[PDB]
Amino acid sequence: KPSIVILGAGYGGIVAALGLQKRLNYNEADITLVNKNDYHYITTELHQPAAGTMHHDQARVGIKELIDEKKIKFVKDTVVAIDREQQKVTLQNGELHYDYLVVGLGSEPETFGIEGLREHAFSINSINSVRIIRQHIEYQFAKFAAEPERTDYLTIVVGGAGFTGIEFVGELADRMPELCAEYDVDPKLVRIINVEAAPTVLPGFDPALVNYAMDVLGGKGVEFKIGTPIKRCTPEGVVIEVDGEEEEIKAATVVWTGGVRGNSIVEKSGFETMRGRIKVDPYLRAPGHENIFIVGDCALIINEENNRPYPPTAQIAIQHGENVAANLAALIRGGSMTPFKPHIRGTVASLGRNDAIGIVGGRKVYGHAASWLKKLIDMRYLYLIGGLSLVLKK
Amino acid sequence: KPSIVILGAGYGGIVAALGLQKRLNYNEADITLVNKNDYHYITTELHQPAAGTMHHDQARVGIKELIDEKKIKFVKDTVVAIDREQQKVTLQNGELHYDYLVVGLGSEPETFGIEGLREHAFSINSINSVRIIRQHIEYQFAKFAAEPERTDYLTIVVGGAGFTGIEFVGELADRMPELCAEYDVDPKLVRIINVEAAPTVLPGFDPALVNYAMDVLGGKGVEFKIGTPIKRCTPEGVVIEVDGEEEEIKAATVVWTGGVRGNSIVEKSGFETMRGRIKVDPYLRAPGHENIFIVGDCALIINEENNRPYPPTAQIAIQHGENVAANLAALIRGGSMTPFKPHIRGTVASLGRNDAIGIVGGRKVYGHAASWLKKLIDMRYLYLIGGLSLVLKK
Ligand SMILES: Cc1cc2nc3c(=O)[nH]c(=O)nc-3n(C[C@H](O)[C@H](O)[C@H](O)COP(=O)(O)OP(=O)(O)OC[C@H]3O[C@@H](n4cnc5c(N)ncnc54)[C@H](O)[C@@H]3O)c2cc1C
Ligand SMILES: Cc1cc2nc3c(=O)[nH]c(=O)nc-3n(C[C@H](O)[C@H](O)[C@H](O)COP(=O)(O)OP(=O)(O)OC[C@H]3O[C@@H](n4cnc5c(N)ncnc54)[C@H](O)[C@@H]3O)c2cc1C
Ligand SMILES: CCCCCCCc1cc(O)c2ccccc2[n+]1[O-]
């Protein structure tokens, strides 16, 4: 029996694994699924627990529940490095050998070398991280009543006005009334600030959607600072550049949604990478490796029409997983692989609990409709991996 | 018309104000009630929100609701000093003059000059403080999952094994299962440590009850270090003395229940004070001042039978308030005052939500019975100050 090793149980990894379990018969191969946690989390909704609008347990599921213990062997450990020559994967507590390898370790934050951003700012990339963000903000609001001169406790700075940042500041904006009521806080004193180095909010997106989103968020008191880069980050706050002059923002909380890169383990293992990402062949394999597959945020796909990269998304990650599952099955049985072509359908960005903006099939959508559509998509992924029972569980 | 000014709306202050409300007519005197908050909190239960076993709103009530808008004028401000000579009380937002003064500003923490104890340890003395404590602890538990090597996050040091410390560690012990469930924490790694400089817990209490309480709490994994004083306190933890040799405990959370003193305002105003408290005459007046009354934790009472001091408690504070109300009513109307005689009917100490120990009148009580007893006492105070409606609201 040949050995298939999947690193990371994210969208790409979980979809690849479930695909392989569905397609292959017993002892056709030995499949090992590796994750640093015994759970798989819904990354696309991680902004809600970070704000506290949703419990974090509703954003994750047990891996053992989803998979087949007979077909797939699950290992809970942390990947340290990959040795291409030895075809071996190093772990915190052991080592593994692969005939075939699928890499889906997802993304890690890119702080661009900005000072203090790594040490003193938070990221929305895991259950742990969002629990920390939530509890941090609650702690600051708790501290304010005893020390009312410190309005920096009530100031939250979100760096980067991208997809994630917009969704997050929307959730925070919705969370603020209950949060203020809980800690005897004057709602007027609260400051939610979204800071973008780029000249436009949601750069590379349709201006109508951007302006609508900006109007809605601004109505709920969210402030936007545009064309404003962050020079440095401290525990007290951030230093930004306005009109070519340094300016200071005092904030107990700084959340970084500025940029992401592929996992550093991949680059550190000797792969040639752009932004930590691998520009894979039409079969989603690593260039030079017939037995190594890259999925999700780790893989880089270029759009032949405009020669610009596809953004790192869960939507395309799932498709990577399905394609890799099929190609692995074919490779295992002697067959020919099918080239991967991405089909990018609608996309929705939430703006609080009851509002959203997005493009589906060329058709722009707003409000309650778009909100329900996004909820629908989430339910679709839940169904796809867990069935009706998983959707019922939440 | 004479002017009576009441400083602090605690047990003594609130009871005094309500008593004056019942006894006097609409123009017999001018009564001013001063508080730094617009609410009165149930100090005797503040340990529950501190652990997170109860919502903080269940520990407080609005002052304007309880009193009579016609009879008593309520001022929300923070007392700064009292000028005995001018008979004036200075405030953050104004000043007042008194013909008669009632001082019931309660207690402040006493750290005895132990290093770093004031700066880096928490106290259970207000709604704000317990919200800060609970959110702090939750924050540490939130941080643990990302850094499992930092077990100091799961270590809580409670200094002083008095009434408050014992009740608090009991509440923490009950709180730990849900807390651990919330943040993916192994309960075995959690350490709750109660540190006492004295060789025995709860001096002046029945040793059977004490040993029983320690047995019960010890069953819940609570650690006791007795005869161990705290040499100093740091953000990392505390430094204690064992066998005349220094030892270190690494703890993210340190809560001080070691000692209390009378409000520092009293001492700073030129009054003669012992432990920040005033040894009052049989009429609860300040020695040398016929128009100044001291109540609650600010007042020091000695038992004439055995010459030992009465501990600063809510029960005796309430009794102080009623006595001062009666005596002031007599003084304004030309009558004879009655000396204060304290009647201590016993007190019960909780050991988590479902356990307690206590002596009532003469009968020793354990378990669910004692727990229900404590709840009943709470109901008694609630009825006494707010009527049936106050009890009904909770
Ligand atoms: C708030 C937020 C909102 C988003 N909304 C959308 C949306 O609406 N639509 C959309 O298309 N995309 C959205 N995305 C992007 C989407 O979530 C990611 O593109 C998706 O996670 C793809 O990443 P992945 O499949 O490669 O794996 P990931 O989701 O990144 O998961 C990687 C897995 O591997 C584990 N892991 C990582 N390193 C190791 C290691 N050394 N050892 C062991 N295990 C490891 C991790 O614990 C994790 O389980 C959003 C992202 C965020 C943060
Ligand atoms: C966990 C805990 C459990 C306890 N259990 C019991 C028990 O079971 N039985 C018992 O008899 N006793 C118990 N006690 C003790 C009791 O709570 C206090 O002794 C009680 O509060 C009496 O103090 P006080 O009424 O004088 O003032 P406090 O109740 O302490 O407060 C005085 C009021 O004045 C306000 N104030 C303070 N300073 C200022 C200022 N400068 N300006 C304006 N306002 C101010 C405060 O906000 C407060 O509202 C317990 C105490 C604690 C912490
Ligand atoms: C149900 C009809 C709408 C179809 C659009 C789906 C495209 C789409 C868009 C997303 O933003 C996704 C985010 C996470 C997972 C899947 C996603 N999908 O599948």
Numbering used by the authors:
A (entry chain B), B (entry chain A): 3 to 396
What did the study's authors say about this model?
NDH-2 catalyses exergonic oxidation of NADH and quinone reduction through the co-factor FAD or FMN. NDH-2 comprises two Rossmann folds that are responsible for binding NADH and housing the co-factor FAD (non-covalently), are central to NADH oxidation.
To determine the binding of HQNO to the quinone-binding site of NDH-2, we co-crystallised NDH-2 with HQNO using an improved NDH-2 crystallisation platform and determined the complex structure at 2.8 Å resolution. The structure was solved in the P21 space group with lattice parameters that were highly similar to the non-ligand bound and the NAD+-bound structures. After molecular replacement, a distinct electron density that corresponded to the HQNO quinone-head group immediately appeared at the Q-site of two NDH-2 molecules (chains B and C) in an asymmetric unit. HQNO molecules were confidently modelled in two chains. The structure shows a HQNO molecule bound in the hydrophobic Q-site localising in the C-terminal membrane-anchoring domain, which comprises three anti-parallel β-strands and the first amphipathic helix. The quinone-head group of HQNO is nested into a slot-shaped quinone-binding tunnel with only a few notable contacts established between NDH-2 and HQNO. The HQNO aromatic head group is sandwiched by a hydrophobic clamp formed by the pair of Q317 and I379 side chains, consistent with the previous MD docking model. By contrast, the HQNO alkyl carbon tail is exposed to the solvent and disordered. Our bacterial NDH-2–HQNO structure suggests the inhibition mechanism of HQNO is to block the quinone substrate accessing to the FAD isoalloxzine.
